[PDB]
Amino acid sequence: LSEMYERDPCMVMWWYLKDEVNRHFVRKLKTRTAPLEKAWLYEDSVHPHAEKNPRPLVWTDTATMGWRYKDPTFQRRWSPNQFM
Amino acid sequence: DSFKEHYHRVHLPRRLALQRYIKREEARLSRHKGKAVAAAAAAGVQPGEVAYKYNRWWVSNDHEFVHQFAFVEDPDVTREKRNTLPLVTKENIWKEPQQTFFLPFAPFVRVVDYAKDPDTKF
Amino acid sequence: SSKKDRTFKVMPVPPPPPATTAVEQRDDFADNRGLSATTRTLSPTFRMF
Amino acid sequence: APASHYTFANLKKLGLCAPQVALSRQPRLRPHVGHLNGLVYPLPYYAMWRGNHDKYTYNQATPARWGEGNTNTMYHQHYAHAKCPTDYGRGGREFQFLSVKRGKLKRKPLPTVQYVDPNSKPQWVFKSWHNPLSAPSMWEREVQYPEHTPAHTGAKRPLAVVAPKTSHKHLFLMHMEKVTVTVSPLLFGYGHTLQKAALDFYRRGLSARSPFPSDKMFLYYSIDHITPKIEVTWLDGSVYVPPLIEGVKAQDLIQMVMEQAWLAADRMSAEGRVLNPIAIDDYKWEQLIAF
Amino acid sequence: GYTRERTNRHFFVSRANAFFSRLPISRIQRALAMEAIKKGSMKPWKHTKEQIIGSPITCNFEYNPRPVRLIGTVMDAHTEETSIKGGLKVYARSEEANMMLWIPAGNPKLKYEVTAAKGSFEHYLDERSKWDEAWLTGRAR
Amino acid sequence: GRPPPVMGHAKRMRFAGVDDNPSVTHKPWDTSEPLMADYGWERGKLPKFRARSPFHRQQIARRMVTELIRKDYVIVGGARAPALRILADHVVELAKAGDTDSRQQLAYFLHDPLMVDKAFDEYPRRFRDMNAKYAMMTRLKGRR
Amino acid sequence: KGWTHNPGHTRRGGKNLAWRPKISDAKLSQFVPLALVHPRRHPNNWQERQFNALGYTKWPKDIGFYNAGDNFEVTPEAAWRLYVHARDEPYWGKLHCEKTIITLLPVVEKAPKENMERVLDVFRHYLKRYGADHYIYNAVMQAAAFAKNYEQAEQLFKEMETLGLEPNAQSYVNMMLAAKLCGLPPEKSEAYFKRAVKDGAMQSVMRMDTEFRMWMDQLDRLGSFTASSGYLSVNEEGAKPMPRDMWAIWGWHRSESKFISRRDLIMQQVRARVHSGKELVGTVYTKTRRQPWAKFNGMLRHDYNGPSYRAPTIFPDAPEYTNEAGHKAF
Amino acid sequence: IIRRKGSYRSRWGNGTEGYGAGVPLSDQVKLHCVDNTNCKHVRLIAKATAERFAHCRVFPAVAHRVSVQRFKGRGGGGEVSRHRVKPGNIYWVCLFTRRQTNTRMSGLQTNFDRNTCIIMNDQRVPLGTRVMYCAGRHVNHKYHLKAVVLANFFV
Amino acid sequence: WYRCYPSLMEEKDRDMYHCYYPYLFDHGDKMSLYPKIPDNPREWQVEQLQTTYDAIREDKYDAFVRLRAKFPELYQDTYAWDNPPPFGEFNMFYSVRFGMIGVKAFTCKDYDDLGNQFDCTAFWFPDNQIVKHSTRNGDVGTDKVYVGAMNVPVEFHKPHVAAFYKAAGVPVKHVSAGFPVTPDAYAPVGTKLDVRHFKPGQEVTITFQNTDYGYQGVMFRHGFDGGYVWLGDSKWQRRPGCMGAEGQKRIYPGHRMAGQTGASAETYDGVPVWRIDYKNSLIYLPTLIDADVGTYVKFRDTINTKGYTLWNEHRGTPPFPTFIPSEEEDLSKLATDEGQLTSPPLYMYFRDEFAAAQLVTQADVEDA
Amino acid sequence: VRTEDFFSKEAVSHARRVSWAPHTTEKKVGAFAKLSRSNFNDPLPVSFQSEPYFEEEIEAYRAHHRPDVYVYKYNVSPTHLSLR
Amino acid sequence: HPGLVPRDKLKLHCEFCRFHWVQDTLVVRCAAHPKEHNQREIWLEPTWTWGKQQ
RNA sequence: UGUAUAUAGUUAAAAAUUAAUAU
Numbered sequence A: 001l002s003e004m005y006e007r008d009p010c011m012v013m014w015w016y017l018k019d020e021v022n023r024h025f026v027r028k029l030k031t032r033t034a035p036l037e038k039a040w041l042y043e044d045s046v047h048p049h050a051e052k053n054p055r056p057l058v059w060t061d062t063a064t065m066g067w068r069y070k071d072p073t074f075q076r077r078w079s080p081n082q083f084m
Numbered sequence B: 001d002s003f004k005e006h007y008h009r010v011h012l013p014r015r016l017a018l019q020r021y022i023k024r025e026e027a028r029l030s031r032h033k034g035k036a037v038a039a040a041a042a043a044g045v046q047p048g049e050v051a052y053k054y055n056r057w058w059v060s061n062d063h064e065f066v067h068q069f070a071f072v073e074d075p076d077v078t079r080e081k082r083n084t085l086p087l088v089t090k091e092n093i094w095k096e097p098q099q100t101f102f103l104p105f106a107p108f109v110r111v112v113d114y115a116k117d118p119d120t121k122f
Numbered sequence C: 001s002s003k004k005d006r007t008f009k010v011m012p013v014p015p016p017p018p019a020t021t022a023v024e025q026r027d028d029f030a031d032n033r034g035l036s037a038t039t040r041t042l043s044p045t046f047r048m049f
Numbered sequence D: 001a002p003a004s005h006y007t008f009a010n011l012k013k014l015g016l017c018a019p020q021v022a023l024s025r026q027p028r029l030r031p032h033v034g035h036l037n038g039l040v041y042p043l044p045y046y047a048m049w050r051g052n053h054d055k056y057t058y059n060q061a062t063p064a065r066w067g068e069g070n071t072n073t074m075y076h077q078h079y080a081h082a083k084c085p086t087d088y089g090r091g092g093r094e095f096q097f098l099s100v101k102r103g104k105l106k107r108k109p110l111p112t113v114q115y116v117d118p119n120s121k122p123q124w125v126f127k128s129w130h131n132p133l134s135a136p137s138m139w140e141r142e143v144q145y146p147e148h149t150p151a152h153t154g155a156k157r158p159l160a161v162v163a164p165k166t167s168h169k170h171l172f173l174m175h176m177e178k179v180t181v182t183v184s185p186l187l188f189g190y191g192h193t194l195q196k197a198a199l200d201f202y203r204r205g206l207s208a209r210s211p212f213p214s215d216k217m218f219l220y221y222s223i224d225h226i227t228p229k230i231e232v233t234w235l236d237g238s239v240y241v242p243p244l245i246e247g248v249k250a251q252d253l254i255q256m257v258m259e260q261a262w263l264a265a266d267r268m269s270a271e272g273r274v275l276n277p278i279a280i281d282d283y284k285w286e287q288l289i290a291f
Numbered sequence E: 001g002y003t004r005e006r007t008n009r010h011f012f013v014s015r016a017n018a019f020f021s022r023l024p025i026s027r028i029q030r031a032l033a034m035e036a037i038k039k040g041s042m043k044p045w046k047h048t049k050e051q052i053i054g055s056p057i058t059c060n061f062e063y064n065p066r067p068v069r070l071i072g073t074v075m076d077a078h079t080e081e082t083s084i085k086g087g088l089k090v091y092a093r094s095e096e097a098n099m100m101l102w103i104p105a106g107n108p109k110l111k112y113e114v115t116a117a118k119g120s121f122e123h124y125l126d127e128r129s130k131w132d133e134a135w136l137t138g139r140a141r
Numbered sequence F: 001g002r003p004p005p006v007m008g009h010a011k012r013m014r015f016a017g018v019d020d021n022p023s024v025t026h027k028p029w030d031t032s033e034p035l036m037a038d039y040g041w042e043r044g045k046l047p048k049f050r051a052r053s054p055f056h057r058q059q060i061a062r063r064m065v066t067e068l069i070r071k072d073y074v075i076v077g078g079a080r081a082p083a084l085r086i087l088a089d090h091v092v093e094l095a096k097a098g099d100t101d102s103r104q105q106l107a108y109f110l111h112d113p114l115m116v117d118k119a120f121d122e123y124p125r126r127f128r129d130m131n132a133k134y135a136m137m138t139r140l141k142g143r144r
Numbered sequence G: 001k002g003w004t005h006n007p008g009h010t011r012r013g014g015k016n017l018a019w020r021p022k023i024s025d026a027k028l029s030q031f032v033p034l035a036l037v038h039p040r041r042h043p044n045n046w047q048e049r050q051f052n053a054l055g056y057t058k059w060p061k062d063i064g065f066y067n068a069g070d071n072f073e074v075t076p077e078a079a080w081r082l083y084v085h086a087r088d089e090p091y092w093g094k095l096h097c098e099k100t101i102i103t104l105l106p107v108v109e110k111a112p113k114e115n116m117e118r119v120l121d122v123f124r125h126y127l128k129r130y131g132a133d134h135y136i137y138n139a140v141m142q143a144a145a146f147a148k149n150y151e152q153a154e155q156l157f158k159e160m161e162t163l164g165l166e167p168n169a170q171s172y173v174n175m176m177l178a179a180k181l182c183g184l185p186p187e188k189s190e191a192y193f194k195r196a197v198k199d200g201a202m203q204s205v206m207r208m209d210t211e212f213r214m215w216m217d218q219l220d221r222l223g224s225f226t227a228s229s230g231y232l233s234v235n236e237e238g239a240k241p242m243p244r245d246m247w248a249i250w251g252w253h254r255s256e257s258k259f260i261s262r263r264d265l266i267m268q269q270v271r272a273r274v275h276s277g278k279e280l281v282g283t284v285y286t287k288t289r290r291q292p293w294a295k296f297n298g299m300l301r302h303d304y305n306g307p308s309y310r311a312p313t314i315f316p317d318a319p320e321y322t323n324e325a326g327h328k329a330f
Numbered sequence H: 001i002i003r004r005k006g007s008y009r010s011r012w013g014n015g016t017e018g019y020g021a022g023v024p025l026s027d028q029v030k031l032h033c034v035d036n037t038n039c040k041h042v043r044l045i046a047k048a049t050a051e052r053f054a055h056c057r058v059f060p061a062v063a064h065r066v067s068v069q070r071f072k073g074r075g076g077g078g079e080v081s082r083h084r085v086k087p088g089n090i091y092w093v094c095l096f097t098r099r100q101t102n103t104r105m106s107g108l109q110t111n112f113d114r115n116t117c118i119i120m121n122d123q124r125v126p127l128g129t130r131v132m133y134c135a136g137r138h139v140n141h142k143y144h145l146k147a148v149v150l151a152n153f154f155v
Numbered sequence I: 001w002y003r004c005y006p007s008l009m010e011e012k013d014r015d016m017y018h019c020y021y022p023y024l025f026d027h028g029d030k031m032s033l034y035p036k037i038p039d040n041p042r043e044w045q046v047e048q049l050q051t052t053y054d055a056i057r058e059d060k061y062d063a064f065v066r067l068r069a070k071f072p073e074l075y076q077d078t079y080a081w082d083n084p085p086p087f088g089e090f091n092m093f094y095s096v097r098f099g100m101i102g103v104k105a106f107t108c109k110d111y112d113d114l115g116n117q118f119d120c121t122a123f124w125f126p127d128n129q130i131v132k133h134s135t136r137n138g139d140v141g142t143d144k145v146y147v148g149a150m151n152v153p154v155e156f157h158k159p160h161v162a163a164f165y166k167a168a169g170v171p172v173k174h175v176s177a178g179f180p181v182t183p184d185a186y187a188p189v190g191t192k193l194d195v196r197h198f199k200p201g202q203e204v205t206i207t208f209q210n211t212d213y214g215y216q217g218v219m220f221r222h223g224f225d226g227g228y229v230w231l232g233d234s235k236w237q238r239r240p241g242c243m244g245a246e247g248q249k250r251i252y253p254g255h256r257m258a259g260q261t262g263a264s265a266e267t268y269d270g271v272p273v274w275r276i277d278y279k280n281s282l283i284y285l286p287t288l289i290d291a292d293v294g295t296y297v298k299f300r301d302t303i304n305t306k307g308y309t310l311w312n313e314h315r316g317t318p319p320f321p322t323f324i325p326s327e328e329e330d331l332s333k334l335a336t337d338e339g340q341l342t343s344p345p346l347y348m349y350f351r352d353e354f355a356a357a358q359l360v361t362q363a364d365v366e367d368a
Numbered sequence J: 001v002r003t004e005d006f007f008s009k010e011a012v013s014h015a016r017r018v019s020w021a022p023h024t025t026e027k028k029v030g031a032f033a034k035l036s037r038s039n040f041n042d043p044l045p046v047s048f049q050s051e052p053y054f055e056e057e058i059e060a061y062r063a064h065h066r067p068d069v070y071v072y073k074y075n076v077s078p079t080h081l082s083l084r
Numbered sequence K: 001h002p003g004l005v006p007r008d009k010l011k012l013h014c015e016f017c018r019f020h021w022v023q024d025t026l027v028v029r030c031a032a033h034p035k036e037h038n039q040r041e042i043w044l045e046p047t048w049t050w051g052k053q054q
Numbered sequence L: 001u002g003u004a005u006a007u008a009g010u011u012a013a014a015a016a017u018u019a020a021u022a023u
């Protein structure tokens, strides 16, 4: 992830949006990307969008816990499943 | 179109619009510093400038000389090329044939004073 | 095996407002307080009878 | 004023041969022949360590360990005083063997010497590698001004700058001439006090281990509640009392007076006192660790 | 994955054979071969016959020991004019060996002076059979 | 490099320059030769129209020349035309020269003797002042 | 069944030189940053969790506030209100009292009359508890200098000898500073510095004429609070109730951290205030050689889930929480 | 086994086409030795997987068998002054010339009548006294010449 | 690629105790040996000795700037510390001149003073002129100079093409290509380049369209073996072998295959220059290129040859912007006798024989 | 002919080196050119692989028994300033 | 350096044989007998990842 | 030559002879 950060820090962020937009909208290729091209990644604060007046995002992180790394391609094969 | 190819076919005209912005703003900062005071911090000294770095000759952790090369092309000098005519070339350059067979470097202490700055190797 | 569940999971709760009541505004599983602590903005206009 | 390259005749004499930059079968090292996509500069190898590409180059953020790209806005007791927060550069393997920028150059002028009156001609003391670290001509100023010469004390040259930093076991007579240790047994104390810290220093000095001349140390019982004093006199007669800070003990005083012994023997060597050979070498300099 | 393998831009596909009459190609090769008969590397030739055989005395200034001097019996005359080709293909029968070797005729170290009046359609056949008998009985059988 | 980049033999293509290079092989790149059985898509060869054999192709080169001389027009088809017009500029290059070497070098080539009796009489009178391009290749419109 | 025309293991696909450089991982691994610091690994959720997870407290601005340099300070007139309250306490040691005076300086230079009795009441009381020392003398002398009452600095200095106390190495600087900022020329500070060199209380390694300059050129870098030249002439403070970076360091390594849990700050102040039978004290050798590189380097249990959760040290605070002003900058 | 790869770019050709021309003389090519020895060299088979001058006898030390023609005629005692090659021995022969057009970087391309060699010992010390043939300029390298003392003159 | 990796210097340790010269901290206004002491004194961390005069630094730096003036002969190369190279002037490691379009014209064999034969292809530089100067958004390192060639009737170009040259003011040029230059290597639109822009000893890089070979099979396109002649092989004299392995099912991209065999943009990287007929605008290279006569071939410079710059001090310095012949000089007067330039000896020793080291003199021939 | 490396280090920092000009027996003109006839040694033991970090060292006489001379919560020395 | 299969097997054979945190792996490094008595705890390579060495 | 019973190590020449850009 750091060797990817040398190349472009914005790509480290774009890789993860793709993983949350492809968390439901994988089905058809038009809705797989059309959201992705709605966010604007900037490795620093200066950005051309004062003319759009981006309203701040009143949001505090919910999970104080850390991020586990779960392999894409991890298969759960049985769930807790009341019928056991 | 792949993933990484996508991110650029989306962000290629999004970085250009970003840097072309700063320059377009760089002209704005270049204005309100005309009537303003000599220079603030303002990301350096805040003309469109590049300060010089006397810190470029290093001896690395392995004890070997590492020089940083920094070239600062002047936007006013380059346009002063694309208008004027270059001078007639000196005849001692072209009428002379460039040597083919660059020969290896020979070590040498400079003069009768053994300064020489390699620290050694014997 | 089975299809992956691609539904829309609900999002986690926002943080409650700071306490500044001293009424034990912090307590979560108490009889008095409904779970949601949403004293947002022109809520005083929503004066109920 | 020599020639930095061998000549053909010079190269031919030894029996060697001229290196081909030509149609030779050899590699003719030129990586970047197909990889570097864009204008490639005649600096030979400025894009190899990156991976022999020129790809990304536009991002300013890079994974930075201590003292690298954006670390400049954190206080690291080393890189705080060892790198100007401006020149911090890119990541490790993304080093800048060549950085090309656009804009008008501003070459700020060099700094000048502080507390040095202009044109004041200084006497020059020349140092070099040759001097073994034992040499007094090694640990002191190189350019000796009349400004940095203490005259209230007799000094022929500004005092030393750097001092060896090593732990001293024993109180060997480096250059002292008389080490007196005054206490007042009228003062009393159980447990670790200054009374105990100074009196073991007497034992630790009078020890059969320390090469200190046992007959040159003088105990002195006082009366008027004199806090335990430790007074060392050097060959020039300038007495020195190591301050007995509370919590001190033997190995500190044996360390204080011995460490100061190199400074004080330096000041004696500055006034013009000839110095003697010292037997012990607390600073290991002629030693190598063997097994 | 895939690859172009054929570049047909206007810069690569276009050909200057049209505009080539601007250049006097051979009248350069004349003068090009004229600056080599002046340096002494080559001496003019105008001969179609009268050169099918002769008697060159080759002086390949090979730095190996010393210059090699081989009496020879030219049998090519590759080019028929002072141009760059040259090509004598002298037989040269060194002492016991038979070595059909052909001089490029422009080389400064590989010099040779042929003499006419022996350019006989006989003396040529004299050596051809000499090299035809040498060729055949040299296969190591 | 020192040897040619593509060694002694390789067929470039139709529509390819000569790219002269030091080689042992012999290439004409010129076709001033009259009544020649050098059919091919190279430079020194006239276009090889299709036929069963370089012999039978030569047999088609006979009855299509002896029928252009017999009656001054022949409606010839395809790659025979660019291959014939160069044989009409050769017959006149054979009929102009005149010497009894040529009049046979056409007698060997024409199926009938009266033609070689004609070609040498009208053509020196006809083309006494024209020095090249004796055959006009005008294309009819309706493809066969 | 041998002799391939194509020798070597040049792989097929992995050729991009940006995401797979042809560099042996033996020589490429030495760049993998195993001490990677800037793309920080501590989110903002924790910055407050790890605050309270030390036992630290959040005070309102008037009591104190982590300043622009993330160094907790006490606000004057909130310092004196401590000394009003805890002067009788048994655990209000010697240097506690003088530290009160030093905090009363950025007001005794601004309120030279209403706060010059607090200094003396700290003075007058300090002598009643502890006989008489230099701490209180160097401090109150420094306080009298900032009050621009130079005559009081002289009136304090001559009592050091009157009490036998040899004027400390500072007791000259407290005076040198006074004779300067009170509008008096040199030779009233010079004659003081030249006293110090002879008595050896101060040490000058240079010709005595230039050290005194290097002294004053630090004593005008430190210009008075009411002037506008120097560092003290700056009044801007970073108002912060908690430091913006709770894991900042003041050494070289993460285990040389800056903010230490109360329950370890105490077991530190213990060892620095007891016998030192392992590490020598008062010497530039420092036997305990710093090697914060050869120490442990790996994410623990508390580098992933973040700091533990200890309930904030917070007051039911019956006093009315009234907000009834905006106070700032002393 | 120096190979090439017929690809209109790598191609041996035939000689007669510049330096590094072609045909490095594969394993067994029945050379015609010319030392003053028992080797009567109507045959001396080659056994090393290459041979040439551009391929540079300088480096390889090409082992060669002796598919003997083994004498013109000899006689005496059972064991004699050893110059008389046994019918099957192996020797690092030294190739002199070729029947193939060997272009050099001077454009001179020599074609000899018979491709010959001189038997040499295991230690490159020529097993022969004199030499009854010429030898291209690929000799004079210190590799063999220091033992190939200029038995005669070159071409 | 070992011996190609330059000296490795980690960024984390390019600090004060490394700098080969006195390390200089800038304060925004002036350089100074010491770190900037932040004015808000609260901003100082505790226990961080904010240095204002360090007798160890100041004296090591006193010995530098003084001794450079005292003994200048020795410290001459240390003057690039404070006297940086100005812009222009052909910086050795920086400047990159453009290249000139060319035409393959013929081939000739040429020999040195030594008997080294070079198959020389002679390129004609018909009419090379700057047609337009480019950039990319005015960025750095993205500056390209375009060079015309072969003055041509305005008809032979399509009207949309010729309408460009007519706009630029240059006479319409048959062909034009874009060379990357460093901005200090510009010229005015309308500069007529001349062949002497190259130096007889240079090493040029040529790019052209190597001669088309049609649709050649695999035993020609690449080197494939295959097929005994009379030893079986029903129909397999030239067909490729096994495409995939067995179970990949997915013929691996690049196997190579049959193909169109070479009408592509080829490149020779470091071919040196042999002669220059600056009266004929001919430039002779000691090589054979595989292109039809008339193949427009563009000539850059070879940039670095064996880890060493091409245009360095010891080995020739180029006519920097481009060679502009003097005003007294013209070519209509002189002849091919005088218009000829030649090169140094490319090969050290006559190459038919070996180097003087391997060839042995009679002294050892008389081994005894 | 020890360790064929032969100019393998050629490097000593401005720090951690000592000074610049030696000479063997002769003088240039300066009327005082008795410098060294110096030696050519190895740099300080293994350069920075052992100790990548160094703490700031004051002049010796400023180092030993560094006196505590403060102004309002800052330590003013004849050369150093620091927030105690 | 023989990976002492568990951490607990580590023993300091020589006086100069001490412990060291070589990148999260407790190892034994000795100046004397430099590789002869060296021991290194078994653990993942210093630069592992989550897909390569779990 | 270092080293010790023989003797290393950067390199260079030569050799295995060939060059490679989709909008």
Ligand SMILES: [Zn+2]
Pocket (backbone or CB within 6 Å): K012, K013, K014, K015, K016, K017, K030, K032, K033, K037
């Ligand atoms: Zn051990």
